[PDB]
A paper describes a structure:
Structurally, the PIP-family proteins organize around an N-terminal, Rossman-fold domain, containing a core, six-stranded parallel β-sheet flanked on each face by an α-helical layer. In summary, a mechanistic scheme emerges in which binding of the coniferyl acetate substrate within the active site of EGS leads to deprotonation of the p-hydroxy group (PUSH) coupled with expulsion of acetate ion from the C1 substituent (PULL).
The co-crystal structure of EGS complexed with a specifically designed inhibitor, EMDF ((7S,8S)-ethyl (7,8-methylene)-dihydroferulate) provides a view of the substrate-binding mode within the active site of EGS. However, EMDF cannot serve as a substrate of EGS because within the C1 substituent, a cyclopropyl group replaces of the C7-C8 double bond and the orientation of the ester is reversed. A key interaction between EMDF and EGS is the packing of the inhibitor's phenyl ring parallel to the A-face of the cofactor's nicotinamide ring (interplanar separation 3.4 Å). The para-hydroxy group of the inhibitor's guaiacol moiety hydrogen bonds with the backbone amide-nitrogen of Val114 and also interacts via a bridging water molecule with the side-chain amino group of Lys132. The inhibitor's C1 substituent bearing the cyclopropyl and ethyl-ester moieties projects into a cavity formed by the C-terminal domain of the protein. Although the binding of EMDF exploits shape features of the EGS active site that are inaccessible to the coniferyl acetate substrate, the structure of the EGS-NADP+-EMDF complex nevertheless provides a useful framework for probing the EGS enzymatic mechanism.
Residue numbers in the entry:
A (entry chain A), B (entry chain B): 5 to 314
Write the structure that this text describes.
């Protein structure tokens, strides 16, 4: 009906699949752009059975992108780091088509316009800033989403629940606060804000009060849930910093991000601005899965671990 | 004709594919065991077009393995680290069938019975030793292959030829010697020795005199080949050792191996034993691609990088 038509790039991705499912769950006509050679064949079939329209092609196909843009209203990009500046191909098509009502570039992490990181990570988020500056320069309607930490991803990474080991690695002192959100919710809320007038040309941050914690607190709560105690092994901050300078790329990128997230506490090191919008306060009919609920999920039916591409 | 029939486990793997191709090139009837859900569909079609017989199944299918064992003469395992002890399923089937003429377990690296490493790596090669002990206890005919370093893999890992950076990382002093061999050759030679009476119940080491070098010498030669100088950044040994103790698994495994190969120089830290067989001395009609030739290949048509499973 009146539902805005949504085009998602990187829909088969780690976080992208949750945006595709959330879009369909909310009854939005959904277009998924995917490479002809993608190995996400079975995932694409699932999307198709849920009602999505699959469009195979390459970002280099300018004409195809323009013709596709003319058929939709909202464009969301969930592409990976290696393709951040490739989003300029998406942006060029949006500019030519001229009918797009909202563009959400691939952020879904830290709020890059208010935080700085070590060189390895700073270079990547500087690219995301370049995208933002171009959007604003062209007066393209947007929404910048800071989803903070992907919860299943980091519960898997930090707690290694699928590992029977007796020790646990802590980065830095482990006292830095951070916020983490369940991927399924990140996906749903992203679709909601992409069409909410309250998020037009604004930064939206996902920071529900029930999802703020520190590494030590997460370990403690997990220990209580499963009835086991771990020996905590800390990796000194100076140690982490040194590695970012000596290790090659892309090996040093994760290290620099670990420093930014769990040592500097970038997802919780700032206060909200006047124009900022915190997503959990937007829909009284929805809520973010809490940390206790998340841990329960890992006790009853834990999701597989993942590793971002660099 | 009268060629021995070869069954390869993990044939679709990084080194495994080179063994399958080498087996077919040498005219051996070749059986490839692969999981029903493998994503190596296009590689499998290639094997098939080359003459290989594909057999889909799981290692847990004891009866299937036994009936398969009965149809072949030689069994080679190129499975990954996570499945080392899973090789006991292959061994049980071999014991029951009773007709196998030679079994080559998944080693193709350092000579585990004469070297020791840091805990992260020591645990993995200890498993490989367990397999070797069971083979000998059961009087199963074997050949243990120490292929040393996979060259394309490590030229990519150490030189990052696909990276236009001005710096290069050196592990330790960079003075430790190591031997590396081209994957295509490792595969060919493995098939040759699997049927050479000279390799029956012996350790075979791939160490051609033209393929021995240090990190610094490798960097130097690469610099001359491409006409560019790099800034060398060293990672102290004590630094590498500390990481193996603080970083969680699997992350700490590669670090421990880097120490073993490029700091301890495990592939060149020993002299040959009386019963050792150095493969390059075996066939006057063949030879290992040299380091110079390997570098030339990376200048004209470099192979993509890779990452072992942990
Ligand atoms: N906040 C956090 O904790 C967190 C965690 C992870 C990631 N992130 C962020 O979330 C965003 C997406 O990350 P992700 O892990 O979801 O991405 P991903 O799964 O690695 O990749 C997303 C999609 O990119 C497409 N793609 C891959 N290579 C491509 C290429 N060469 N050219 C064109 N398309 C290509 C693929 O789709 P097809 O195969 O269909 O073409 C893939 O499904 C990024 O901005 C990332 O930084 C944040
Ligand atoms: N010397 C060196 O520099 C070096 C470098 C790398 C590796 N290595 C060694 O070479 C050997 C093989 O390494 P690799 O990297 O070639 O192996 P790989 O490519 O990681 O895997 C080999 C094969 O295992 C099968 N497999 C994967 N997961 C499985 C599971 N859960 N159950 C059963 N089968 C599974 C897959 O075949 P299907 O999909 O067909 O089932 C896969 O192609 C190892 O012993 C390794 O340590 C040495
Ligand atoms: C440290 C292990 O995870 C990562 O390397 C990257 C994928 C994680 C990530 C990527 C981009 C981000 O903005 C972010 O902040 C929440 C987190
Ligand atoms: C350092 C990056 O590579 C590795 O972590 C492992 C795959 C490399 C390897 C695995 C097993 C080995 O025996 C070996 O010695 C030559 C090398």
């Amino acid at each position: 009906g009146m539902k805005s038509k949504i085009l998602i790039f990187g829909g088969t991705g780690y976080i992208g699949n949750h945006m595709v499912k959330g879009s369909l769950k909310l009854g939005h006509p959904t277009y998924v752009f995917t490479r002809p050679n993608s190995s996400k064949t079975t995932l694409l079939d699932e999307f198709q059975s849920l009602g999505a329209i699959i469009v195979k092609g390459e970002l280099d196909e300018h004409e195809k992108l323009v013709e596709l843009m003319k058929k939709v209203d909202v464009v969301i990009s969930a592409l990976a780091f290696p393709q951040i500046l490739d989003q300029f191909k998406i942006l060029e098509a949006i500019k030519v088509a001229g009918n797009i009502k909202r563009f959400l570039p691939s952020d879904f992490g830290v709020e890059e316009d208010r935080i700085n990181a070590l060189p390895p990570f700073e270079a990547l988020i500087e690219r995301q800033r370049m995208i933002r500056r171009a959007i604003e320069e062209a007066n393209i309607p947007y929404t910048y989403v800071s989803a903070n930490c992907f919860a299943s991803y980091f519960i898997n990474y930090l707690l290694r629940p699928y590992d029977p080991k007796d020790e646990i690695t802590v980065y830095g002192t482990g006292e830095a606060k951070f916020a983490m959100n369940y991927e399924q919710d990140i996906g749903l809320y992203t679709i909601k804000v992409a069409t909410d007038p309250r998020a037009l040309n604004r930064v939206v941050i996902y920071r529900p009060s029930t999802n703020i914690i520190t590494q030590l607190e997460l370990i403690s709560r997990w220990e209580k849930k499963i009835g086991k105690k771990f020996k905590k092994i800390h990796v000194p901050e100076e140690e982490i910093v040194a590695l970012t300078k000596e290790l090659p790329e892309p090996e040093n990128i994760p290290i620099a991000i670990l420093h930014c997230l769990f040592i500097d506490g970038a997802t919780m090191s700032y206060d909200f601005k006047e124009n900022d919008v915190e997503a959990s306060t937007l829909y009284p009919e929805l809520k973010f899965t809490t940390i206790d609920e998340l841990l329960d999920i890992f006790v009853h039916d834990p999701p597989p671990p993942a590793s971002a591409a660099f």
